[PDB]
């Protein structure tokens, strides 16, 4: 005695594809810092600081990418594998 229940109508043909994706402003300028092997590290910079200006984005090797500080340590403790935030220059752009 388990009885064990299943369903399947055997295919799943749907398209969440109702999104054209991009929108974003094109050709903004972004320099590749250094990082771990594992990830990789961009600034987007601009000129100084009294500008538009855009932060830093951590690349992940999955490409679930990190557009903030917060996003870095909740994706390790999430993710583990992935090195410590202690070897990953935020403040590259700082001091």
């Known amino acids: 005695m388990h009885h064990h229940?299943?369903?399947?109508?055997?295919?799943?043909?749907?398209?969440?594809?109702?999104?054209?994706?991009?929108?974003?402003?094109?050709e903004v300028v972004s320099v590749e810092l250094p990082a771990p092997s594992s990830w990789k590290?961009?600034?987007?910079?601009?000129?100084?600081?009294?500008?538009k200006k855009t932060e830093v984005?951590?690349?992940?090797?999955?490409?679930?990418?990190?557009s903030n500080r917060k996003q870095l340590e909740q994706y390790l403790k999430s993710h583990p594998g992935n090195p410590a935030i202690a070897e990953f220059d935020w403040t590259t752009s700082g001091t």
Do not use: C, D, W
């Not at 590290?41 to 500008?51: D, M």
């Not at 984005?57 to 990190?66: D, L």
């Open 5 to 26: 229940h299943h369903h399947s109508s055997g295919r799943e043909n749907l398209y969440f594809q109702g999104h054209m994706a991009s929108g974003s402003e094109e």
């Open 57 to 66: 984005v951590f690349v992940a090797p999955t490409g679930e990418e990190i």
């Open 41 to 51: 590290k961009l600034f987007y910079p601009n000129k100084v600081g009294s500008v």
